[PDB]
Design a protein around this ligand. Structure first.
Ligand SMILES: CC(C)C[C@H](NC(=O)c1ccc([N+](=O)[O-])cc1)C(=O)N1CCC[C@H]1C(=O)NCCCCNC(=N)N
Lengths: 27, 10, 250
């Protein structure tokens, strides 16, 4: 339900240093 | 090499 | 993890460490999937060729950790095993087919900034993200090299590889319950899971709902980060029926 949403990142709208690399691979 | 954990944890 | 990097604090709050009681050592990685269920590779608890058969009392789960060796006071939580559940058709004899197991905790773990469950995929998350080219993220406290150890949690992003290419990289018989991930030699980029990363999660972030899903479990490989070779992962969605059955029943 809140699965998958990290307190220190998603929940605060902060991105970690490499999650963008994942996104750019999802075409 | 691993730090001991609380005895409560065994 | 070979050729990865230090984790950020709270970067993988579902990360679990399987820890041997005596001698106190790292057994494997694992994942938190609810406040009482932990997912791992079956080979972490059962592998007869190597005389591995662990029971509940031989270990504990350490959640919310970053440092490998440190007891992280006021951050990690250490939990006892109520009951271990291995896939009844886990094939340790030949190729680690259905390399998956569940662990129910004695008591619920409290979520925190450092402790949080990952989602499990449904059929569409799977179809949508489990595509050659698409990268996942693998985390663990395993070996930094095929043959040293990290001070803190390691992370590496890796692309899922085409099925024929996976099959052509090994003499091992691959099944639909597995996928492989890693860079080709020609791609230049490197990285792989390694010894000790076993049972840890391969996660992907949905671009649709921005949630992290665990698509794979670190299962096997032939060496670590070798050219022409790929890491193999348990296909979590393909074994979802068993997961829900265990959890629905127990
Ligand atoms: C290939 C088989 C299905 C089983 C497999 N054993 C092997 O056949 C194997 C093959 C080659 C080497 N080697 O060094 O060249 C080592 C092991 C193995 O991986 N096993 C045997 C039981 C446990 C599991 C394992 O160690 N898992 C460790 C996970 C390491 C992840 N590796 C990578 N991502 N590279």
């Amino acid at each position: 339900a809140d699965c998958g949403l990290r307190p220190l990142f998603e929940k605060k709208s902060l991105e970690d240093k490499t999650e963008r690399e994942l996104l750019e691979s999802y075409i | 090499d691993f730090e001991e954990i609380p005895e409560e944890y065994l | 993890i070979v050729e990865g990097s230090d984790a950020e604090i709270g970067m993988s709050p579902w990360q679990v460490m399987l820890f041997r009681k005596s001698p106190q050592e790292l057994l494997c990685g694992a994942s938190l999937i609810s406040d009482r269920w932990v997912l791992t590779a079956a080979h972490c608890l059962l592998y007869p060729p190597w005389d591995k058969n662990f029971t509940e009392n031989d270990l504990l789960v350490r959640i919310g950790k970053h440092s490998r060796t440190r007891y992280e006071r006021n951050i990690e939580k250490i939990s006892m095993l109520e009951k271990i559940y291995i896939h009844p058709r886990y094939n340790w004899r030949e190729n680690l087919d259905r390399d998956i197991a569940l662990m129910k905790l004695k008591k619920p773990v409290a979520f925190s900034d450092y402790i949080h469950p990952v989602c499990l995929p449904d059929r569409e998350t799977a179809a949508s993200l489990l595509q050659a080219g698409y990268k996942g993220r693998v985390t663990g406290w395993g070996n930094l090299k095929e043959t040293g150890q990290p001070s803190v949690l390691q992370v590496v992003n890796l692309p899922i590889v085409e099925r024929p290419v996976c099959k052509d990289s090994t003499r091992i018989r691959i099944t639909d319950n597995m996928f492989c991930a890693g860079y080709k030699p020609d791609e230049g980029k490197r990285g792989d899971a390694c010894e000790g990363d076993s049972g840890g999660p391969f996660v992907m972030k949905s671009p649709f709902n921005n949630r992290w899903y665990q698509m794979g479990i670190v299962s096997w490989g032939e060496g670590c980060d070798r050219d022409g070779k790929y890491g193999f992962y348990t296909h979590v969605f393909r074994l979802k029926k068993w997961i829900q059955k265990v959890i629905d029943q127990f």
